[PDB]
Symmetry: D2
């Protein structure tokens, strides 16, 4: 396979089946079904169309299973999945209520909202692993923290420090990232709902009320459309790379102590090297999300699709990093003399 | 010169003297002088030495003049300015109080603290310019905001929208970046005071008291040393590129609108200022990668990672600064938006 | 799926099954078998063990199939496939000849050689596609090349030009990249054969002759080991990015001409935008391979795994770009007034 | 100043005045005079205007001093120096002859040719420094090469190697970089001469002849205009980073050996750490030149000006790297146990 994260043998090291499952084609489609179901309900609530048409959409979509091969044919034909997805959804809905699915929405609305739904779940997992890792590393520090370490500054031995002193440079930044992530998670996962040209012209003056209701139903933040405003995507990408960056410092430290040999015992430091790799991977990948801030006019295919290529691997690198760092810390049997 | 920001002619387009002068050798030395002065005062305040010894350091540093040839020679020999700087400062201090300048501090303490003092200054300028530009762009939208525009999605004409619809994509992210900056500036400019191996071993139990007073005197946040913790710098650099990125979207829009030619009127006759915004966006989008690579800063101190930040960050704050200058210039050229 | 290149629906746009199948675990395993097959033969040739010892290896590995799941657990245990892969290869070989597989080799030898064998295959497909695309764009220019076009310099209508004038900016760099790729392919795909610490300490005086024979059998260049010398990889990735870059310039022009709409007929320009995307993708990933030039000591796991993460998608991006560009050119019905 | 390369005290470590003075406003201007002097000579040779007017331009620009302030107002008015520069040049040339300076040329013609003229000079300096350092590292190798070293693979002590073995990983790629540079320098520094939209409209059938003559006179390659074809610039930039990447590998090895301390003597390995810094700097900047490959239409101010911002510092980082490595090499008094 192209990426080691999903590779049938290399995933023994780089694997993260829990985070990767959220970027599966099935998970995307489920979240896209969620968008369309909630949209129909929000539009009934605002009396755009009748209640019995929205319930026909809900029940029609409740047991909706997609034809994957035909969805691929869709993106081969159109460039984007949603017109063929919507076609399949209308085929599942009884009566004239099928003409009402996807009303007022555009392709970017359903794709970006699905992304935000799944990024939200990925961030919950990442925070949980972050808090557990902070505890594990804290246990490494409370076990061996009093023991002397030879300090090292600029590749030379320096004065003696302790294990607690060195550990604080691993743990304290991780605590900051947890807090950064928790603050982000409060309103950073936003509904994408702006219509063909970002103006919601099919909804007129009901635009604001439908948007509010749809956001609440999906558990997402109500914000005006951000079809070309991608600063929250780059902000989340920054955080991802901040976490890998700190864990790569941890990995670089452990590998150096391993090479010196006198001041650790491990149960060769492959996990430590893997942390550095992932740090440097995310530090490269951050550039692509920042290049994608320049998204011209109302919708930019060039800028938008660079995020498709690069973001899922950034959140996987961060999750893998947390797994591998947990595996490394269990290998550490003593720090210090 | 190497950079267009400082170039004798390319600065007609790329220059920002107000921001760039925060990265002058002189401005750096002044901030290092302030560090060493306040360190002396902080240590007398924590009863480490008496008031008259700190006062000998304070008055000696007030009329201290650094020798620049010598300082350059010092970084050739040592890699770092402060040993030679401290050597010179001691010569400006009379008596045995000269032995006490720089007590408890290491070179990364004075270099990073100086950087934070001056990045704080630059952040105040950038915040103010962001605020002004938000208003300017708001005035563009109030003048022509109900006027029709041809929407354009994925390089094809879409349905009609208004000028205020398109302008919200310029204005709204900038308003978020203003708020991001203000939040960062709350406690993000921190004192660097850790000593030789990050443990402030010279001060003992008085390390917390000295650090607290030193941070106060310099107007920086009191936080444990971050010699190898560079997340605040990567976070700050992220915001720098967030601003240029949005402004490059704005510039790209204007340039496309200029090329079509039917729904914009630019004065001066073309869209060089618009292209420049795009260039600067792509510049910082590249440079952000450098500060993220420097997150891996091994052991108690890492020359390799730390010096990458020296090569890259000042031009990132300059690009953000220049972008705000260029965005304001471009907006002043815009006579009409819409039909 | 993390990458739209392999995605069950996004591959309708980004797919390239021919190039992607070169990075499958099966193709890797088959390449690694070839390394170990030809290694035994080269060592028999230099009289290190008997001919029938080598022949038992050749035929035992001819019908070798890997236990993929056990290989996954091998990389979890060891950090790298090869110890496990070798253990299974030994069970497939009859007699005392089983001890002779992998003699004189290290894990990086078999992995980097496998890479090089399959990258040579990828570069062949990419050069064949490049030549064919140059014909196609040449056919566009011999149909419409006489027609006038509005020149555009720095986002402003400039003076008139012709279609041949503009098309030369598409064709000429591609012709240079073809020659570039052809020149690299001469001796740029090299054998990796250095043993534990790069010295081939198992072979003594027979090192030079074994390596030469092994390189010749595999169709690879005989160079001294390059375990920590990754400039040829970065050089190759540069080339990969050079191709997508030019095709991104092509895409950007087509997308711009489509927006204006008066001097092109297509048959909305998703393909033109996709090329711009893949250009900016490869212009980011090139950074990873250059960060990987810093590879410490005799083997750097941190620098080497960054290539694992990033290079397969660079060759796929280049390959997909050529596919998409061939599709985009086939949509162009008219250029000019 | 913004960059340590030029900084009043930081240039103690990062300075390279010989390379940096090739990117001074003066060296730029002098190269643009050279373009314009040779332009008039080439055009009088092809009989586009009289010889007296050609030698009025040559002699007019012999003692040309630029009003620098005015040139800066010129880039604030036009975006580029040349319109104000060409205006100053017609004030230096007597008669009506002054109507002919810049005839048939555009802004990007003189700017990119100036660049090419000075990168050619930078590359000569870099090649010389590279050969000298190959010899210097070779002398370190021939002094201590037989002495035992502890091998380290994947941050762990491996079997014993010798000094000569490890030194080959520093020397052999640099010998390949030297040949790469010599191969590039033969035809890679080209004249830019395309006119307003790449078609040399003012020239007519004299186009090819004037371009051949101008390139000969300036000691650059005759190639067709590459206003929007920046592959030679990304190619050259790749080379620059290959050189710093290898020196960064050398630098990281020395830093690690100093930290262990048992197997070297240095007469605090700051130079070794600086080489890593310069490798990672260039490994980041290579991305900008590859992003600048997408250059839309006949001229792209956006992509072109990103080269302006990033390429001079890439050539300076390579230049400085070779200076720092040569300083580090002289500090090495012993390699080996
Ligand atoms: Cl779409
Ligand atoms: Cl230091
Ligand atoms: Cl290995
Ligand atoms: Cl121009």
């Amino acid at each position: 396979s192209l990426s080691p994260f999903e590779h049938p043998f290399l995933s023994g090291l780089f694997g993260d089946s829990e985070i990767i499952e959220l970027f599966s084609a099935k998970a995307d489609i489920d979240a896209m079904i969620r968008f369309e179901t909630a949209l129909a309900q929000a539009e009934a609530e605002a009396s755009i169309f009748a209640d019995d048409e929205a319930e026909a959409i809900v029940s029609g979509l409740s047991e909706f299973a997609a034809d994957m091969s035909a969805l691929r044919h869709g993106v081969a034909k159109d460039g984007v999945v949603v017109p063929e997805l919507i076609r399949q959804m209308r085929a599942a809905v009884a009566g004239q209520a099928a003409d009402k699915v996807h009303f007022g929405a555009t392709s970017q609305d359903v794709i970006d909202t699905s992304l935000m739904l799944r990024l939200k779940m990925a961030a919950e997992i990442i925070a949980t692993r972050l808090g557990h890792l902070i505890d594990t590393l804290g246990d490494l520090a409370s076990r061996d923290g009093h023991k002397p370490l030879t300090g090292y500054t600029r590749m030379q031995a320096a004065i003696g420090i302790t294990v607690a002193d060195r550990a604080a440079g691993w743990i304290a930044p991780l605590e900051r990232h947890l807090l950064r992530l928790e603050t982000f998670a409060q309103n950073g996962f936003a509904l994408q709902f702006g219509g063909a040209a970002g103006t919601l012209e099919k909804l007129g003056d009901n635009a604001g009320a439908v948007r509010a209701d749809l956001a609440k139903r999906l558990g997402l933040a109500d914000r005006p459309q951000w079809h070309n405003q991608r600063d929250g995507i780059a902000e989340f990408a920054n955080l991802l790379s901040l976490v890998t960056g700190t864990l790569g410092k941890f990995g670089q430290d452990i590998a150096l102590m391993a090479e010196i040999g006198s001041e650790i015992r491990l149960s060769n430091p492959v996990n430590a090297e893997t942390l550095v790799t992932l740090a440097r991977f995310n530090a490269v990948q951050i550039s692509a999300l920042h290049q994608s801030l320049v998204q011209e006019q109302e919708r930019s295919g060039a800028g938008w699709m660079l995020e498709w290529l690069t973001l899922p691997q950034m959140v996987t690198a961060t999750g893998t990093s947390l797994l591998v760092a947990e595996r490394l810390a269990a290998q550490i049997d003593r720090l210090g003399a």
